[PDB]
Amino acid sequence: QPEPDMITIFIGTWNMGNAPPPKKITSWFLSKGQGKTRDDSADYIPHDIYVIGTQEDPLSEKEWLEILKHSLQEITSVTFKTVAIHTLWNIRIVVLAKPEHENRISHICTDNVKTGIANTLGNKGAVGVSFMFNGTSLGFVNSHLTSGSEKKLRRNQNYMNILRFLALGDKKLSPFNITHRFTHLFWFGDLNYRVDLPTWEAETIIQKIKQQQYADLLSHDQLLTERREQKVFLHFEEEEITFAPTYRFERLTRDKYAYTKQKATGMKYNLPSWCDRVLWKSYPLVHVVCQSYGSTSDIMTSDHSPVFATFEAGVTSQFVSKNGPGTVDSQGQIEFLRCYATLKTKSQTKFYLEFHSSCLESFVKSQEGENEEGSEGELVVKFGETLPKLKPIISDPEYLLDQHILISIKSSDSDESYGEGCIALRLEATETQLPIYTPLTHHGELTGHFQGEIKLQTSQ
Numbered sequence: 001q002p003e004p005d006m007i008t009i010f011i012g013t014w015n016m017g018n019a020p021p022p023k024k025i026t027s028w029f030l031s032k033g034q035g036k037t038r039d040d041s042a043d044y045i046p047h048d049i050y051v052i053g054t055q056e057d058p059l060s061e062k063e064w065l066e067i068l069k070h071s072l073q074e075i076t077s078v079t080f081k082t083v084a085i086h087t088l089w090n091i092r093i094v095v096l097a098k099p100e101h102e103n104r105i106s107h108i109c110t111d112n113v114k115t116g117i118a119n120t121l122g123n124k125g126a127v128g129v130s131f132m133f134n135g136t137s138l139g140f141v142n143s144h145l146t147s148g149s150e151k152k153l154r155r156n157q158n159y160m161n162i163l164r165f166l167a168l169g170d171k172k173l174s175p176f177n178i179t180h181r182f183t184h185l186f187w188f189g190d191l192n193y194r195v196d197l198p199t200w201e202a203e204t205i206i207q208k209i210k211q212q213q214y215a216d217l218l219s220h221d222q223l224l225t226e227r228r229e230q231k232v233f234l235h236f237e238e239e240e241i242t243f244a245p246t247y248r249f250e251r252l253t254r255d256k257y258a259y260t261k262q263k264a265t266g267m268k269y270n271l272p273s274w275c276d277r278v279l280w281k282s283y284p285l286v287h288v289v290c291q292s293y294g295s296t297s298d299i300m301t302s303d304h305s306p307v308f309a310t311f312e313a314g315v316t317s318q319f320v321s322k323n324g325p326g327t328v329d330s331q332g333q334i335e336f337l338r339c340y341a342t343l344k345t346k347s348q349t350k351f352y353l354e355f356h357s358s359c360l361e362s363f364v365k366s367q368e369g370e371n372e373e374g375s376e377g378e379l380v381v382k383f384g385e386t387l388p389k390l391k392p393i394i395s396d397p398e399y400l401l402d403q404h405i406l407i408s409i410k411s412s413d414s415d416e417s418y419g420e421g422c423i424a425l426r427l428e429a430t431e432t433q434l435p436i437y438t439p440l441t442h443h444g445e446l447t448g449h450f451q452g453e454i455k456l457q458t459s460q
């Protein structure tokens with residue numbers, strides 16, 4: 001029975017509004033309703049992995065697991081295995097997989113982050129799960145960010161705290177946060193970004209939604225505008241939104257947006273908004289295609305509608321050769337020519353590089369680079385031809401061309417990372433000098449760039 005080179009992943013996000021769900025929620029798992037929906041001809045085809053994020057979830061883990069499993073069983077006639085479940089307050093993540101994947105899934109991690117201080121610590125934050133699927137690392141984050149139209153900066157701060165402190169994936173990847181630890185990272189939840197239009201325009205917005213004319217609303221969506229200005233979710237992708245705003249509905253219908261200020265809202269307006277979102281980030285030149293992104297129309301227990309997204313994702317096999325794992329393959333090497341880092345830092349320490357990859361026995365430390373002043377005020381760290389030759393565990397090109405090298409640039413003085421990035425080994429040619437590039441981030445903010453040339457030798 002051959003190992004897969006693709007899997008499909010279902011991502012669901014639903015703020016349940018502290019109410020139990022209705023008896024049928026199958027439309028969510030089938031990607032049916034509004035937006036980019038799944039073809040009817042696929043209804044019996046199970047996804048390989050289902051990841052369910054809830055917020056304001058009033059159910060026990062047991063109660064929710066029973067509803068989810070019985071839902072998937074009805075759709076697919078498959079009894080799904082529970083990979084992981086993790087809850088922080090009323091924020092929950094469930095990962096379910098087809099039973100045939102049980103012995104493909106390992107290194108299962110869960111964590112949570114509580115956002116805010118004092119006043120603002122006690123119900124917002126994130127949960128996450130990571131695991132390996134054969135040779136591919138998968139991470140999943142469900143976050144409930146700060147509410148309120150005038151708190152987009154707080155949401156952006158919540159995002160930075162979550163990606164700094166959520167402890168998922170391979171702990172040996174010590175310089176890297178969750179935005180570099182996974183082949184594929186999915187980040188979803190009630191992110192709570194709003195449509196920033198005046199309160200007086202509420203009925204105009206409702207009109208626009210009834211016409212299915214979303215363009216003038218999306219141009220004021222705080223998550224789209226913050227992402228454009230590089231304030232949040234740098235280097236993440238989101239599928240185009242073609243469904244109505246998922247918040248705030250009167251319960252038991254979808255015919256009415258409840259936007260007016262009430263004692264129950266803290267006298268805040270809730271203009272119709274796309275609070276409920278799915279984003280992703282995959283390593284360079286790995287296959288990932290969004291195949292659905294939408295909301296259900298028939299689940300009306302909450303003031304939010306459920307959101308679904310599905311993805312095709314490239315995966316690789318757990319490779320063994322006569323040499324690696326447990327030794328190098330002298331027939332393989334990775335060389336770096338004319339490399340330099342450009343950093344936004346005002347500091348003057350020496351810097352060195354660390355190379356981390358599951359194609360190496362352990363990470364590799366470079367010598368210090370030579371600092372020069374760039375012509376526009378920047379720090380340029382030149383490595384020239386001085387970077388070590390990397391010795392992969394397996395030289396087979398069917399393995400090596402599917403790998404990635406994570407790069408951290410670190411201060412000699414403090415050993416703290418100033419910048420992290422990733423290079424694909426999916427090259428146009430082997431034994432050939434080719435340009436490489438990655439942006440560098442730290443705490444998920446742009447800090448610089450790394451560029452140069454690579455030369456990859458495989459056994460072929």
Ligand SMILES: CN[C@@H](C)c1ccc(F)cc1
Pocket residue numbers: 081082083097101102103105106108
């Ligand atoms: C051995 N660990 C259990 C939790 C497990 C369950 C499902 C799966 F796909 C992989 C592992």
Ligand SMILES: CN[C@@H](C)c1ccc(F)cc1
Pocket residue numbers: 223224225227228235236237
């Ligand atoms: C990450 N891709 C960039 C081009 C982008 C930024 C904001 C946005 F709303 C859509 C795309």
